[PDB]
């Protein structure tokens, strides 16, 4: 028994006519995906299908495989090709055949690190190939066999043998097939082509080896219940009885998140929207705590021209809780906006404002010229120029050593006023009050779904209830400390929790040489809710599909439960279910004056078997 990537039994494989001659010609070979490997089949009796291409971009920005065959050698290369739009192999006679087979496949091959030359692969001889690519290893399997069908796949059994295990290290997403037509836009000809394509899926198979070295039979353990029984018994034959095979579950159909109302909004609109702003040498540092910060408003607005955010990602900030948040405010020129960074130097960087190399904050900033400037300029923004020493980060003093800024409302960008807001987050030994918002959902009901009630996670079905909570309790618990009921944070109503269905599956079958029919029992499940076809009959042990409720009673043959038995009967043949009987009535003729005495006798011999001992073993 082995689990691998196999092609499922009894499926549809696609049949491509690469070239069709109706009158005229029709050339079309597409580019197909490469999911988990491919099964490729051909039966054409000529040298037309002559290799393959594998790759992702199929351009010169990445590497690509190339497998070519010319009836004398097989050449495998891994290079950085730039393939044509319609790649094909052109043989041109100088002569009829055996000439310089040109390469119209590509036009460039640079910087490439593989080569493999060997004996031909493709040596009416139906040919089958299987391709795989796992852990930087390209594996090929092949097999040839002669057939006589007109147009179909034979009904037999053959096993493919390994060919090559090349150690390439590239990524593969798409693949394409090569054809070498002829030479004789319309200056080339060809006869015909057709091939079968199929895809592999992860399955589990049961294979049989004979006394010699070959594989003879296989069983797929997903086709029907009988195959599942054969695979779970590790045998190709099954005796009469009832066997347990697998479990039955119900899957969630949606997701639910419920949280209390969004209040106590944190005043982020005071440091951004404000008629007055501070200067470079005198900040407006503000502390923020015990509030709910709406970060998504800031980075979803089409009015900020600088949002480079170091330390943390701008999107995960909604799932982090801090203790304190500090906000600054500068009004500087447009040229030094780049100087506010963990690493930078200059006038403003070293004299007015400096930042450490572990900032874990960011520098949201924008432009404003129609409001912060007037007709006369109003040079009311000052800054320092000379200092006795470099100023360390997170330190500034209040105090002609100061000069004003022009900000003339005609100059180009690079000198116009720009407003900068700088935020920092801190986590000290404290309950970390500051947290981000939490969104909710529409509270669907009556389906087995997943719920997140204010911190309670789980799966199940919700419904109304009659319980009454004291007006401070949130949820309830059972005897075994399992959650039973909850309360909606927004509507303050009580809801119950019930697990969605689950059970086991049993298969009822007669002996294997008799018939191939089965019946299926789903245990303890009311099957008005079963996802799933024959007669349906409900018992006290679950419900049964595939049997008819016969009308009489006999002795028990295959026990099921609660006094119900099943058997293979003849009246056409079928499987019937009934209630077992105990015996035949034997009412005795009792009076107060009659006796019965036997007159003649028999001698009887019976047998009894008893085990006495077992085997003596020892382990070191």
């Amino acid at each position: 028994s082995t689990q691998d990537l196999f092609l499922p039994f009894f499926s549809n494989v696609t049949w491509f006519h690469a070239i069709h001659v109706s009158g005229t010609k029709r050339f079309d070979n597409p580019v197909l995906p490469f999911n988990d490997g491919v099964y490729f089949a051909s039966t054409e009796k000529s040298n037309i299908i002559r290799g393959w291409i594998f790759g992702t971009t199929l351009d010169s920005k990445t590497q690509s495989l190339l497998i070519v065959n010319n009836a004398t050698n097989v050449v495998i290369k891994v290079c950085e090709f730039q393939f044509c739009n319609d790649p094909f192999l052109g043989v041109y006679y100088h002569n009829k055949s055996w000439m310089e087979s040109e390469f119209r496949v590509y036009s460039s091959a640079n910087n490439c690190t593989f080569e493999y030359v060997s004996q031909p692969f493709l040596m009416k001889n139906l040919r089958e190939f299987v391709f795989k690519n796992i852990d930087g290893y390209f594996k090929i399997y092949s097999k040839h066999t002669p057939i006589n069908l007109v147009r179909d796949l034979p009904q037999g059994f053959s096993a493919l043998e390994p060919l090559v295990d090349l150690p390439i290290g590239i990524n593969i997403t798409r693949f394409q097939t090569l054809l070498a037509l002829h030479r004789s836009s319309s200056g080339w000809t060809a006869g015909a082509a057709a091939y079968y394509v199929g895809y592999l899926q992860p399955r589990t198979f049961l294979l049989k080896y004979n006394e010699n070295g070959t594989i003879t039979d296989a069983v797929d353990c997903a086709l029907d219940p009988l195959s599942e029984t054969k695979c779970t018994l590790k045998s190709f034959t099954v005796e009469k009885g009832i066997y347990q095979t697998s479990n039955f579950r119900v899957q969630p159909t949606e997701s639910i998140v419920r949280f209390p109302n969004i209040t106590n909004l944190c005043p982020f609109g005071e440091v951004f929207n404000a008629t007055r702003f501070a200067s470079v040498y005198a900040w407006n540092r503000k502390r923020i705590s015990n509030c709910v910060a709406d970060y998504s408003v800031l980075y979803n607005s089409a009015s900020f021209s600088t949002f480079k955010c170091y330390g943390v990602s701008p999107t995960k900030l909604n799932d982090l809780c801090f203790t304190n948040v500090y906000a600054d405010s500068f009004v500087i020129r447009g040229d030094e906006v780049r100087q506010i960074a963990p690493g930078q130097t200059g006038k403003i960087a070293d004299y007015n404002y400096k930042l450490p190399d572990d900032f874990t904050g960011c520098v949201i900033a924008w432009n404003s010229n129609n409001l912060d400037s007037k007709v006369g300029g109003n040079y009311n923004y000052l800054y320092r120029l000379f200092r006795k020493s470099n100023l360390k980060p997170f330190e500034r003093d209040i105090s002609f050593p100061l000069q004003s800024y022009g900000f003339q409302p005609t100059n180009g960008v690079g000198y116009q006023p720009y407003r900068v807001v700088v935020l920092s987050f801190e986590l000290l030994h404290a309950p970390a009050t500051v947290c981000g918002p939490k969104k909710s959902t529409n509270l669907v009901k009556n389906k087995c779904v997943n719920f997140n009630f204010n911190g309670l996670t789980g799966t199940g079905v919700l419904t109304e209830s009659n319980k009454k909570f004291l007006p401070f309790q949130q949820f309830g618990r059972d005897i075994a400390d399992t959650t039973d009921a909850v309360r909606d944070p927004q509507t303050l109503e009580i809801l119950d929790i019930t697990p969605c269905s689950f059970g086991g599956v049993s298969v009822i079958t007669p002996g294997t040489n008799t018939s191939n029919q089965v019946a299926v029992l789903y245990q303890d499940v009311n099957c008005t809710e079963v996802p799933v076809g024959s007669n349906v009959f409900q018992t006290r042990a679950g419900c049964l599909i595939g049997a008819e409720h016969v009308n009489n009673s006999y002795e028990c043959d295959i026990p099921i439960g609660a006094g119900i038995c099943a058997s293979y009967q003849t009246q056409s043949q079928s499987i019937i279910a009934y209630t077992m009987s105990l015996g035949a009535e034997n009412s005795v003729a009792y009076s107060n004056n009659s006796i019965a005495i036997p007159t003649n006798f028999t001698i009887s011999v019976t047998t009894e078997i008893l085990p006495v001992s077992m085997t003596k073993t020892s382990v070191d």
Epitope: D28, N35, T173
Partner: antibody, heavy 128, light 108 residues
């Protein structure tokens, strides 16, 4: 010459389900990637899902999980999308679109081109 | 989930001038995969530029695009009366595919 056509407008009540179809004519349709895009009135565009008919496994967005289902029929060459458990916010216009160059690699999808051919639009109004 | 933000909410211009539209991403787009769409009222969108540099055939030569990393830009050098519509930026280097927010360009 590849063109896609959709069905007509629909009006629904909350709690029901809707099914929209997309018929493409003039191409292979087998190795394409058929997507689905939703545009609300006076809003932007959103991504719902997509499918490659030859493979048979679709990809869904996280928001529309357990509520939408995308399938395809190769013989009639038609893609279906079904939306269940309707709310009052599921009133928008739906578009088919097509990505010409798509691959698979593992169970996920990989795109090497943008959508070039679009449908026409089907309005689904949900109210009572 | 990569989030794209279009910096100018609305642009008002005049015929014969040039425009400039930006599309900033929260992270770095993988392999610089970006596409630009132009939509008019009552009609489906239309693809103009893919790969942030390449241009689909049949699109006028006045449209161009550039950028990389987390900053991408689109330019129309010579505006025309038929160029006033909504514009969107989309990324397809990962999953799920995410669109922009739109940027109106009109004179009315």
């Amino acid at each position: 010459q590849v063109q896609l056509v959709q069905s007509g407008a629909e009006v629904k009540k909350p709690g029901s389900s809707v099914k929209v179809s997309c018929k493409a004519s003039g191409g292979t349709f087998i190795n394409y990637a058929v997507t689905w895009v939703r545009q609300a009135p006076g809003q932007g565009l959103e991504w719902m899902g997509g499918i490659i008919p030859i493979l048979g496994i679709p990809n869904y967005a996280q928001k529309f999980q357990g509520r939408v289902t995308i399938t395809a029929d190769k013989s009639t060459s038609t893609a279906y999308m079904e939306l269940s458990s309707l709310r009052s916010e599921d009133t928008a216009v739906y578009y088919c679109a097509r990505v010409p160059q798509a691959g698979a690699a593992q169970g996920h999808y990989y795109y090497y081109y943008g959508m070039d051919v679009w449908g026409q639009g089907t309005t689904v109004t949900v109210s009572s | 989930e990569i989030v794209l933000t279009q910096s100018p909410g609305t642009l008002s211009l005049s015929p014969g001038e040039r425009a400039t539209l930006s599309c900033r991403a929260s992270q770095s787009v993988t392999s610089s995969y970006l596409a630009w769409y132009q939509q008019k009222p009552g009609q489906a969108p239309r693809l103009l530029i893919y790969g942030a540099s390449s241009r689909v055939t049949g699109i006028p030569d006045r449209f161009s695009g550039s950028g990389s990393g987390t900053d991408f830009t689109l330019t129309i050098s010579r505006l025309e009366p038929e160029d006033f519509a909504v514009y969107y930026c989309q990324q397809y280097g990962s999953s799920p595919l995410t669109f922009g927010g739109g940027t109106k360009v009109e004179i009315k």
